[PDB]
Write an enzyme that holds these catalytic residues in place. Structure first.
Site, PDB file in Angstrom:
ATOM      1  N   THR E   1      -9.355  -5.317  -0.857  1.00  0.00           N
ATOM      2  CA  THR E   1      -9.693  -5.847   0.487  1.00  0.00           C
ATOM      3  C   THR E   1     -11.173  -5.687   0.816  1.00  0.00           C
ATOM      4  OG1 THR E   1      -7.499  -5.537   1.441  1.00  0.00           O
ATOM      5  CG2 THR E   1      -9.336  -5.548   2.966  1.00  0.00           C
ATOM      6  N   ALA E  49      -0.891  -2.630   4.362  1.00  0.00           N
ATOM      7  CA  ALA E  49      -0.657  -3.891   5.052  1.00  0.00           C
ATOM      8  C   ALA E  49       0.322  -3.718   6.209  1.00  0.00           C
ATOM      9  CB  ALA E  49      -0.174  -4.955   4.079  1.00  0.00           C
TER      10      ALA E  49
HETATM   11  C1  LIG Z   1      -4.548  -4.368   5.163  1.00  0.00           C
HETATM   12  C2  LIG Z   1      -3.721  -5.852   4.768  1.00  0.00           C
HETATM   13  C3  LIG Z   1      -2.985  -6.503   5.767  1.00  0.00           C
HETATM   14  C4  LIG Z   1      -2.295  -7.678   5.483  1.00  0.00           C
HETATM   15  C5  LIG Z   1      -2.332  -8.195   4.197  1.00  0.00           C
HETATM   16  C6  LIG Z   1      -3.066  -7.556   3.202  1.00  0.00           C
HETATM   17  C7  LIG Z   1      -3.768  -6.390   3.474  1.00  0.00           C
HETATM   18  C8  LIG Z   1      -4.539  -5.788   2.311  1.00  0.00           C
HETATM   19  N1  LIG Z   1      -3.856  -4.596   1.848  1.00  0.00           N
HETATM   20  C9  LIG Z   1      -3.228  -4.588   0.688  1.00  0.00           C
HETATM   21  O1  LIG Z   1      -3.136  -5.562  -0.058  1.00  0.00           O
HETATM   22  C10 LIG Z   1      -2.542  -3.271   0.354  1.00  0.00           C
HETATM   23  C11 LIG Z   1      -3.288  -2.519  -0.731  1.00  0.00           C
HETATM   24  C12 LIG Z   1      -2.772  -1.097  -0.742  1.00  0.00           C
HETATM   25  C13 LIG Z   1      -1.795  -0.716  -1.663  1.00  0.00           C
HETATM   26  C14 LIG Z   1      -1.338   0.599  -1.636  1.00  0.00           C
HETATM   27  N2  LIG Z   1      -1.838   1.460  -0.751  1.00  0.00           N
HETATM   28  C15 LIG Z   1      -2.769   1.130   0.144  1.00  0.00           C
HETATM   29  C16 LIG Z   1      -3.270  -0.173   0.178  1.00  0.00           C
HETATM   30  N3  LIG Z   1      -1.209  -3.627  -0.095  1.00  0.00           N
HETATM   31  C17 LIG Z   1      -0.119  -3.303   0.570  1.00  0.00           C
HETATM   32  O2  LIG Z   1      -0.087  -2.658   1.620  1.00  0.00           O
HETATM   33  C18 LIG Z   1       1.111  -3.919  -0.043  1.00  0.00           C
HETATM   34  C19 LIG Z   1       1.296  -5.273   0.664  1.00  0.00           C
HETATM   35  C20 LIG Z   1       2.317  -6.247   0.055  1.00  0.00           C
HETATM   36  O3  LIG Z   1       2.626  -6.222  -1.138  1.00  0.00           O
HETATM   37  N4  LIG Z   1       2.796  -7.128   0.935  1.00  0.00           N
HETATM   38  C21 LIG Z   1       3.780  -8.165   0.572  1.00  0.00           C
HETATM   39  C22 LIG Z   1       3.335  -9.561   1.058  1.00  0.00           C
HETATM   40  C23 LIG Z   1       3.242  -9.616   2.581  1.00  0.00           C
HETATM   41  C24 LIG Z   1       1.966  -9.918   0.485  1.00  0.00           C
HETATM   42  C25 LIG Z   1       4.333 -10.606   0.574  1.00  0.00           C
HETATM   43  N5  LIG Z   1       2.310  -3.092   0.123  1.00  0.00           N
HETATM   44  C26 LIG Z   1       2.746  -2.290  -0.841  1.00  0.00           C
HETATM   45  O4  LIG Z   1       2.138  -2.139  -1.895  1.00  0.00           O
HETATM   46  C27 LIG Z   1       4.017  -1.476  -0.588  1.00  0.00           C
HETATM   47  O5  LIG Z   1       4.609  -1.654   0.471  1.00  0.00           O
HETATM   48  C28 LIG Z   1       4.687  -0.627  -1.671  1.00  0.00           C
HETATM   49  C29 LIG Z   1       4.514  -0.778  -2.990  1.00  0.00           C
HETATM   50  N6  LIG Z   1       5.313   0.087  -3.624  1.00  0.00           N
HETATM   51  C30 LIG Z   1       6.035   0.772  -2.721  1.00  0.00           C
HETATM   52  C31 LIG Z   1       6.999   1.777  -2.848  1.00  0.00           C
HETATM   53  C32 LIG Z   1       7.588   2.313  -1.697  1.00  0.00           C
HETATM   54  C33 LIG Z   1       7.219   1.857  -0.428  1.00  0.00           C
HETATM   55  C34 LIG Z   1       6.258   0.858  -0.298  1.00  0.00           C
HETATM   56  C35 LIG Z   1       5.674   0.321  -1.447  1.00  0.00           C
END
Ligand SMILES: Cc1ccccc1CNC(=O)[C@H](Cc1ccncc1)NC(=O)[C@H](CC(=O)NCC(C)(C)C)NC(=O)C(=O)c1c[nH]c2ccccc12
Ligand SMILES: [Mg+2]
Lengths: 250, 235, 233, 233, 212, 241, 242, 237
Positions: E1, E49
């Site tokens: 990000t 996210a």
């Molecule tokens: C701030 C923002 C707002 C909106 C869209 C994008 C962003 C950018 N941020 C990210 O991309 C973050 C990166 C990050 C990863 C780990 N740490 C801290 C930050 N990703 C997440 O938070 C992802 C999001 C995701 O995969 N959403 C699904 C969707 C909506 C894209 C279809 N969830 C996950 O990875 C996640 O939920 C999990 C993955 N493995 C898990 C095991 C147990 C519980 C939860 C999870």
């Protein structure tokens, strides 16, 4: 299950009286006389054992109670109220004092706690005041001998000598006439016996009279030897036989 | 707790009525000290004058109270006031300003007036104290939880009579010694007894500490009262 | 006798009566009439809705509790909302935990027990609403009458509210005919709509007046109001 | 946080044309000590359901108490408790599955794998599994522990998909179960020779067989086996 | 990000990427990382996210509640503090968020607040947040001037996100662009990195690490 | 513990306890507030009954809630302390969370809400207090004056009065307050406020106290000497015809 | 005095009936629902001429699509409004949509039930019923423009037009005659202003009466004093020519 | 409720008894190896569904309860009995002995005569069953008073019911089979209906017997019920 009288049952009336406290004080008036006399080297507290039945064993009902090794109490009014107040006074001497400073409370402070317990029965929701007046006599290192009256309102006063219950007015008169600041304990016991004969209807002996002293330390009542700084209780309940001995030269 | 159609609090008024039957207590403030004097309620020969304190209490080293009303109610409040002064000392490392202590106590009394269905405390206080902000101070509080500051005041029996007398003889430039005289004269004039003897009095001062620059509470021993009663010509 | 005894639900009269509960019963008689009746295959609620004004909405008497259960109300309407919410939960709980449709009989028992607690607690009032509950469970169609005393009875037909005595007498006479009306929803509604007519001094029951509900063998509990009742007037 | 202490190995089961079969051996193991030998791990509920439990035996005894309370509680104020409102296999299952999942969610599981077998009131076979995680599934064949690894493959050679179930007789199904119990006794170190077996048929009802034994065991070939490679005598 | 916001002569530029990652897995390339709180208020998203989506959507609710209660739009200072105080309640529970609250009010002027899940709240003129923050900083800081035209400031925003999209494995997809004025955000489009990179290379003569 | 209802409805639709709370305000010493073009003046009477008071230490009627807002009241003195304390806490809390001092409207709405709450809660009685809240919104030169009552109703006033004989002084201010022409300055605004009290006090010595609030947290109490000069000029100037 | 939720011998809740009497002593509030919007109007009723009338808030916004007018003990209405706003904003948070007017009304009526102590069955954080009635107006996609009357009895009715407060007996009969399904918004505005003018005890002007409406397009709006004034030359000139 | 009168009575409980006396009549009969319970169900209207407003309640598997007075109060009491029986079974494994169960209900009913914030129950309850050592029958009044009985009756027709009960105790001192006791219960219920003859009634019988139901509580239905009705119909004329 659950209280509907979460309000004070003792309230002020238009004239300023606290009704329930007055009515409790009337309950004390109907009660058997008890008295206390303070000497130079002791205190005596005395009362009559008005027995309910001649089939009852009057030695199983003490009106004179040890509160700490150096503090005893007597009452006039409702016996069962006295009995529970004694338990709480004993307990509060430990929980609020002995478990903190590793020694027993001085007389005034323990009387203070009992007074507090009685005050709360005067302000709390859903209760009536205690129907008793206590006389509490004791000794402590820094205050010497003392005598206190505690009333149903939680008020307490120190006395040289006093009487509560039935014939308390005549007995106080009899005491004001006889008391002085040079009395030895034996003189005080003598006066306590004379004062109490006026009150007693029936037999007047060591079985119908109940008497205790706060005197000197009784090392023979301690239960153990070997610790010089521990000398035994000053509270001592006189025996039936000890009372009869003092009634012969009365 | 409830209001009357008149907009008054029954239980509070009845508590006040109770207090007007209690022994008069007088407080007088001078430029170099404060006087507290109180009449003991009709006593007896056999009462222990020496180990008795029914009207005058120490709250900390700089603040004292004179009581009119039920003693047992007053001990309840005095104890919390003592705790309050120590909490403040622990928090700020300074002695509590008198008003702060007085306001707290007054707030406690006010509470019983407004919620909980318990009876009010049947107590009026005269507070006498010193602090480095307002010097010598005198406050009064009653069962309603109201409080006011005074140069001279009374509570208990005959306040009306005692107040008129104080109004007449009080002057801003008084020393404590003149204030000692005023309080005793006023109690003498207003007693419902023959004479105002030592055995029927409690007496205390808050002075500039004999000779120092510090503050000292003198609670008079019975013998001292007897002397100070001759000095002022009441014997 | 009626003197110092109707102060709360926690006091018996010298006759052994609970006046607060009897007074709660009086709010039912004040309420607008509703009828309930059933055959072996269906159960029907008919209710006369009441307006406050000619400018107002007629207020609903019929509440759905589950796909197989619902009720009509007469008395304090907000009390009916409380009780139907409870019934909705009890139905729901039964589906989720046991995968089981709540027997209409058990729904009766649950409502009785809930009403009862309010006929014995200090500082609480009894419920002030009457209810007619219909359902189709594993043992067919059912109708129940609920009184805020906690008495619930199973009936072939009944009516509650003002002037309901008329409808009741009708159904008492019609018994052997309507108990048999099987596999024809429209005929049973018609017999219900006729029953509610014996309770009219009012007027002629309009498209807004009239509220009909049905449940049965292959029909989820459904509510008809407005244009959808026209074909029965 | 916990760990099984006294345990009971596989529970195996399958559907045939007219009902279900379920079996479990009679052992309560204490780690590698074969401690208790008269342990019933099949629990009839009513007469249309058998609950088969493996895992921790103390938790098994708790689930027994729950199932008996469920029967008592269903009978209360229920005149159809032995007819239309009797407990169904699906009700018993959903209930346990709720309990299991709630307990794992509180981090305090019932340390079990459970198979509910029976026949619904419409004659339909019911076969479902729940475990300590609250995981649930259904299949023509179900087995826990070692049974999942060894019994299923043999049982599936008989009922491989839904359409194999009209085609499978009581005799063939029981034969397959009994054979699978033999295989388990050959290869499972925590299994026992003695087992119980229950048939729940839509016509027969409940047949509960106790004190069954593994028979027709092959051991004669052992005598020819010498050493671990080179040894000749 | 990668997210950024900066104040300049003509208001605020807000620019963000649109990549969602879970480990080395690209979960989405078309994600919305700006929340339109009201017509005068924007929030950006970095970190978890769900944490971001959930709490900034919640923030919008609280901001709206303020409007009904006080009959006036919430200030940037106050809106940011609501989120700051909420996040501080949860400290140590593992919330993961890097956030900018950007807006205009008469009393404040154009304002940027940085808020994160550690509880830090700072008022400033320039912030870059997310795994790509340093890359955006490199371009933004080296070409920044207070007096940039609106046109240039929007380009610098766009170009900074492209920089981070190019270098940071966890940034990419598209650029979403916003301009906040006295009147007050205006959306300036979605710009897919697939096309934008080649367009910028050609027109600018930059990206000479890239072959072809 | 105790949550029995005391404030309930009468057969004719009043809440008796709230109405009786108003009676308590009726007997409380008089308080008045008038607003100038660029200020708000707060005036209160002190009773004659006891004149041996210490004025250094006695709680006064006008209290600071924050550095830009003041409060005065009529009714139960003890009751007023509870409102003043809570208002002060709320004021600090507002600065803490919104990073801005309260508006005078906000603070009033808060006090009024507390008052309202005590009329529908079991176990408690309503406040026997009406209040005047006066001051200036942050960064604003437009003066604000609000009034609250035991019911919790609140509103803004060009000028208002509460307490005993307030009916008279209201009648006075209605005749003498002009909305288009407010008092132009501090000096002339105080004079009107003293005139309204002089209708009720009848010697006002240190019997009248005044507090002036100006924009940007400029709040000052008046001494006897400053007040004296106002009283002196009022009866002197108004005599001949 | 015995109990707070006691039934009368007729089967009525004593305290509920009495709260309805308090509403009768309130200022008049009038609402009219059309196919072009809903108009809410109130009598401000200043107790003294020194009161600054624009500080009298008897018409409040709940959400963009919902507003309401109050009559009775108007201080009681604060926590009802707070609850309403929270319900609406919360609904939008949980569901990314506008709450239905009817659903919002029901919520406000659930809150009104919770008097007493905590009746055996659940809990009640209130000692008396509210002494205020509400007219709740708004628009949603399923039922269009709506007007509801929320009573402290917990019941609510939809109305095409409704008056509450002291003038409500006289105003309602007047509304019986004047309301028709076709009114435009301009006609509705004028009728509210007309009916207020009749029942008010001063002469109606832009300082002692207040107007608002809710349309699908612009949402809920309180008209400023200039706009109402220009509707009062208009009503004068209309009645003068009749 | 908590109020003693000047002569040591509790008027509230005495008033609660009047509610019971106002109720439908119900009975219990103890036989040589079990207990029989019977009750009068008033047919208010033809619309009441026959056999479908069951009054007799089971507790655990081996206890029946019948009652007269406020029906909901009786249900409240039975819910409590069930909780009370489950808790005993939970800790002690064995199903609750009838005397043990009696005291549970007893203590609970007595509690409702101690506090000003509660009313006594408006029912009398007849109950019992089989345990480790035989059959037991109990009757429980609004005051919490209960004793063992040979036969028990409460409600409107209590007086005639008691008189028929007394006759049986006299003519059968030698222990009255479970099957006879059922027949007789039908009879006795018919003979208390004489008071309320203006409205029609339905008869409900249940029993718990060692040899007849294996010590479990069962409802008398079908041919057994009809046979008991016919006996009662014959012996009434
Ligand atoms: C701030 C923002 C707002 C909106 C869209 C994008 C962003 C950018 N941020 C990210 O991309 C973050 C990166 C990050 C990863 C780990 N740490 C801290 C930050 N990703 C997440 O938070 C992802 C999001 C995701 O995969 N959403 C699904 C969707 C909506 C894209 C279809 N969830 C996950 O990875 C996640 O939920 C999990 C993955 N493995 C898990 C095991 C147990 C519980 C939860 C999870
Ligand atoms: Mg009987």
């Amino acid at each position: 299950m659950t209280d509907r009288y979460s309000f004070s049952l003792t309230t002020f009336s238009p004239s300023g009286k606290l009704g329930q406290i007055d009515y409790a004080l009337t309950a004390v008036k109907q009660g058997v006389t008890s008295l206390g006399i303070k000497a130079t080297n002791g205190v005596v507290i005395a009362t009559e054992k008005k027995s309910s039945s001649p089939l009852a064993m009057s030695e199983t009902l003490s009106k004179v109670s040890l509160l700490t090794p150096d503090i005893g109490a007597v009452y006039s009014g409702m016996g069962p109220d006295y009995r529970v107040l004694v338990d709480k006074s004993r307990k509060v001497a430990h929980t609020s004092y002995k478990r903190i400073y590793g020694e027993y409370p001085p007389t005034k402070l323990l009387v203070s706690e009992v007074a507090k317990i009685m005050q709360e029965a005067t302000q709390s929701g859903g209760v009536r005041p205690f129907g008793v007046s206590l006389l509490i006599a004791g000794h402590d290192e820094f205050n010497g001998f003392s005598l206190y009256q505690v009333d149903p309102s939680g008020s307490y006063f120190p006395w040289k000598a006093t009487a509560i219950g039935k014939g308390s007015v005549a007995a106080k008169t009899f005491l004001e006439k006889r008391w002085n600041d040079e009395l030895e304990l034996e003189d005080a016991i003598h006066i306590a016996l004379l004062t109490l004969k006026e009150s007693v209807e029936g037999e007047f002996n060591g079985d119908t009279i109940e008497l205790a002293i706060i005197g000197d330390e009784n090392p023979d009542l301690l239960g153990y030897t070997g610790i010089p700084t521990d000398k035994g209780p000053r509270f001592r309940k006189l025996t039936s036989q000890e009372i009869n001995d003092r009634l012969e030269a009365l | 707790t409830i209001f009357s159609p008149e907009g008054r609090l029954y239980q509070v008024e009845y508590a006040l009525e109770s207090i007007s039957h209690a022994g008069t207590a007088i407080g007088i403030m001078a430029s170099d000290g404060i006087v507290l004097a109180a009449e003991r309620k009709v006593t007896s020969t056999l009462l222990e004058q020496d180990t008795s304190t029914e009207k005058l209490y120490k709250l900390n080293d700089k603040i004292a109270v004179a009581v009119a009303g039920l003693t047992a109610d007053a001990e309840i409040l005095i104890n919390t006031a003592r705790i309050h002064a120590q909490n403040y000392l622990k928090t700020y490392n300074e002695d509590i300003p008198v008003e702060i202590l007085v306001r707290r106590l007054s707030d406690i009394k006010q509470g019983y007036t407004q919620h909980g269905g318990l009876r009010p405390f049947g107590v009026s206080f005269i507070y006498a104290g010193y602090d480095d902000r307002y010097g010598y101070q005198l406050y009064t509080s009653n069962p309603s939880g109201n409080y006011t500051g005074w140069k001279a005041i009374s509570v208990g029996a005959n306040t009306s009579a005692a107040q008129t007398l104080l109004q007449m003889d009080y002057k801003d430039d008084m020393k404590v010694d003149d204030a000692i005289e005023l309080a005793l004269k006023t109690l003498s004039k207003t007693t419902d007894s023959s004479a105002l003897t030592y055995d029927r009095l409690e007496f205390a001062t808050i002075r500039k500490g004999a000779n120092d620059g510090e503050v000292y509470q003198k609670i008079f021993k019975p013998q001292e009262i007897k002397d100070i009663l001759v000095k002022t010509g009441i014997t | 006798f009626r003197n110092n005894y109707d102060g709360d639900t926690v006091t018996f009269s010298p006759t052994g009566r609970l006046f607060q509960v009897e007074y709660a019963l009086e709010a039912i008689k004040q309420g607008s009439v509703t009828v309930g009746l059933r055959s072996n295959t269906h159960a029907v609620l008919v209710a006369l809705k009441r307006n406050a004004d000619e400018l107002s909405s007629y207020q609903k008497k019929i509440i759905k509790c589950d796909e197989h259960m619902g009720l009509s109300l007469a008395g304090l309407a907000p009390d009916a909302r409380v009780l139907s919410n409870y019934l909705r939960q009890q139905c729901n709980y039964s589906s989720l935990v046991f995968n089981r449709k709540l027997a209409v009989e058990r729904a009766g028992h649950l409502l009785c027990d809930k009403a009862q607690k309010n006929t014995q607690s200090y500082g609480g009032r009894p419920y002030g609403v009457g209810l007619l509950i219909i359902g189709y469970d594993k043992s067919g169609a059912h109708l129940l009458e609920f009184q805020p005393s906690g008495n619930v009875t199973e009936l072939y037909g009944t009516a509650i509210g003002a002037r309901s005595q008329g409808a009741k007498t009708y159904l008492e006479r019609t018994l052997d005919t309507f108990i048999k009306i099987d596999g024809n929803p429209d005929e049973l509604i018609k017999a219900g709509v006729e029953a509610i007519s014996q309770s009219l001094r009012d007027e002629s029951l309009t498209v807004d007046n009239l509220s009909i509900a049905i449940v049965g063998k292959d029909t989820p509990f459904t509510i008809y109001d407005g244009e959808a009742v026209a074909k029965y007037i | 946080t916990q760990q099984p202490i006294v345990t009971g190995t596989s529970v195996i089961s399958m559907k045939y044309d007219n009902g279900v079969i379920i079996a479990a051996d009679n052992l309560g193991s204490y780690g590698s000590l074969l401690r208790f030998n008269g342990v019933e791990r099949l629990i009839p509920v009513g007469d249309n359901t058998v609950v088969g439990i493996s895992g921790d035996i103390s938790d098994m005894q708790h689930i027994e108490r729950l199932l008996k309370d469920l029967v008592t509680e269903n009978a209360y104020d229920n005149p159809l408790a032995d007819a239309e409102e009797a407990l169904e296999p699906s009700y018993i299952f959903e209930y346990l599955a709720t309990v299991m999942y709630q307990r794992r969610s509180k981090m305090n599981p019932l340390w079990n794998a459970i198979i509910v077998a029976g026949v619904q009131s419409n004659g339909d076979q019911f076969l479902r599994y729940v475990n300590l995680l609250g995981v649930t599934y259904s299949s023509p064949t179900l087995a826990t522990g070692f049974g999942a690894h060894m019994a299923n493959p043999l049982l599936r050679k008989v009922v491989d998909r839904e359409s194999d179930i009209p085609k499978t007789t009581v005799q063939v199904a029981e034969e397959a179960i009994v054979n699978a119990m033999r295989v388990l006794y050959y290869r499972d170190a925590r299994s026992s020779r003695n087992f119980s077996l229950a048939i729940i048929d839509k016509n027969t009802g409940l047949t509960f067989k106790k004190n069954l034994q593994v028979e027709n065991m092959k051991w004669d070939f052992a005598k020819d086996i010498k050493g671990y490679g080179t040894q000749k005598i | 990000t990668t997210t950024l916001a900066f104040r300049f002569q003509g208001g605020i530029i807000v620019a963000v990427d649109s990549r969602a990652t879970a480990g080395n897995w690209v979960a989405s390339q078309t994600v919305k990382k700006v929340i339109e709180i009201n017509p005068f208020l924007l929030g950006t998203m970095a970190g978890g996210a769900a944490d971001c989506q959930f709490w900034e959507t919640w923030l919008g609710s609280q901001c709206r509640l303020h409007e009904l209660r006080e009959k006036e739009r919430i200030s940037v200072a106050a809106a940011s503090k609501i989120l700051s105080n909420l996040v501080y309640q949860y400290k140590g529970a593992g919330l993961s968020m890097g956030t900018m609250i950007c807006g205009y009010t008469r009393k404040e002027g154009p304002t940027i607040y940085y808020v994160d899940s550690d509880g830090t709240r700072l008022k400033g003129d320039i912030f870059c947040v997310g795994s790509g923050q340093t890359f955006a900083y490199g371009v933004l800081d080296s070409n920044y001037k207070w007096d940039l035209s609106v046109e240039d400031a929007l380009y610098l925003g766009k170009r900074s996100i492209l920089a981070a999209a190019h270098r940071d494995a966890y940034s990419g997809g598209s650029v979403n662009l916003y301009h906040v004025t006295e009147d007050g955000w205006i959306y300036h489009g979605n710009h897919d990195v697939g096309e934008l990179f080649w367009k910028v290379k050609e027109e600018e003569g930059s990206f000479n690490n890239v072959i072809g | 513990g105790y949550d029995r209802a005391l404030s309930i409805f009468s057969p004719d639709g009043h809440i008796f306890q709230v109405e009786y709370a108003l009676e308590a305000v009726k007997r409380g010493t008089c308080a008045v507030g008038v607003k100038g073009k660029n200020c708000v003046v707060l005036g209160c009477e002190r009773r004659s009954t006891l004149k041996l008071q210490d004025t250094r230490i006695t709680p006064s009627k006008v209290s600071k809630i924050d550095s830009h807002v003041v409060l005065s009241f009529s009714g139960l003195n003890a009751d007023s302390r509870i409102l003043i304390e809570k208002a002060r806490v709320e004021a600090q809390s507002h600065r803490l969370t919104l990073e801005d001092p309260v508006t005078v409207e906000y603070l009033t709405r808060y006090v009024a809400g507390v008052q309202q709450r005590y009329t529908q809660s079991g176990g408690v009685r309503p406040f026997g207090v009406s209040t005047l809240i006066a001051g200036f919104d942050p960064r604003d030169d437009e003066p604000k004056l609000y009034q609250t009552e035991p019911s919790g109703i609140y509103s803004s006033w060009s000028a208002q009065t509460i307490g005993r004989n307030s009916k008279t002084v209201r009648e006075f201010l209605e005749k003498n307050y002009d909305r288009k022409e407010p008092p132009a300055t501090v000096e002339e605004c105080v004079k009107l406020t003293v005139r309204s009290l002089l209708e009720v006090v009848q010697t006002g010595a240190k019997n009248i106290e005044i507090t002036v609030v100006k924009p940007d947290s400029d709040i000052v109490a008046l001494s006897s000497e400053e007040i004296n000069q106002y009283v002196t000029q009022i009866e002197q100037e108004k005599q001949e015809q | 005095d015995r109990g707070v939720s006691t039934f009368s011998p007729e089967g009525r809740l004593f305290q509920v009936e009495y709260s309805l009497e308090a509403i009768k002593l309130g200022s008049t509030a009038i609402g009219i629902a059309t196919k072009e919007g809903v108009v809410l109007g109130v009598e401000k009723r200043a107790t003294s001429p020194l009161l600054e009338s624009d500080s009298i808030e008897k018409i409040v916004e709940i959400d963009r699509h919902i507003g309401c007018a109050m009559s009775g003990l108007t201080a009681d209405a604060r926590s009802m409004i707070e609850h309403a706003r929270t319900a609406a904003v919360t609904h939008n948070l949980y569901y990314d949509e506008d709450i239905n007017v009817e659903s919002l009304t029901q919520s406000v009526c659930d809150l009104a039930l919770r008097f007493g102590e905590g009746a055996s069955g659940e809990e009640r954080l209130m000692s008396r019923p509210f002494g205020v009635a509400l007219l709740i107006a708004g628009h949603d996609a399923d039922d269009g423009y709506q007007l509801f009357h929320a009573e402290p009895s917990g019941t609510f009715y939809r109305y095409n037009a409704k008056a509450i407060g002291s003038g409500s007996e006289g105003a309602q009969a007047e509304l019986l005659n004047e309301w028709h399904s076709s009114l435009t918004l301009k006609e509705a505005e004028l009728l509210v202003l007309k009916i207020l003018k009749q029942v008010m005890e001063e002469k109606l002007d832009e300082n002692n009466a207040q107007l608002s409406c809710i349309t699908k397009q612009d949402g809920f709006k309180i008209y400023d004093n200039e706009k109402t004034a220009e509707l009062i030359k208009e009503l004068k000139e209309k009645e003068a020519a009749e | 409720n908590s109020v003693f009168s000047p002569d040591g009575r509790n008027f509230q409980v005495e008033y609660a008894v009047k509610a019971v006396e106002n109720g439908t009549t119900s009975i219990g009969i103890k036989c040589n190896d079990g207990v029989v319970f019977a009750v009068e169900k008033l047919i208010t209207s033809k619309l009441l569904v026959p056999q479908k407003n069951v009054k007799i309640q089971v507790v655990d598997r081996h206890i029946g309860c019948v009652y007269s007075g406020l029906i909901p109060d009786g249900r409240h009491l039975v819910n409590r009995g069930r909780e009370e029986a489950a808790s005993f079974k939970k800790l002690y494994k064995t199903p609750i002995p009838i005397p043990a169960f009696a005291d549970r209900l007893g203590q609970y009913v007595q509690a409702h005569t101690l506090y000003n914030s509660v009313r006594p129950f408006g029912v009398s309850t007849i109950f019992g069953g089989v345990d480790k050592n035989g059959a037991h029958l109990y009757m429980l009044e609004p005051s919490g008073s209960y004793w063992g009985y040979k036969g028990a009756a409460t409600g409107k027709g209590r007086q005639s019911a008691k008189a028929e009960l007394e006759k049986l105790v006299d003519h059968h001192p030698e222990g009255l089979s479970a099957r006879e006791a059922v027949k007789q219960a039908a009879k006795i219920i018919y003979l208390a209906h004489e008071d309320n003859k203006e409205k029609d009634f339905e008869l409900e019988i249940s029993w718990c017997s060692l040899s007849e139901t294996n010590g479990l509580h069962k409802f008398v239905k079908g041919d057994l019920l009809q046979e008991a009705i016919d006996f009662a119909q014959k012996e009434i004329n």
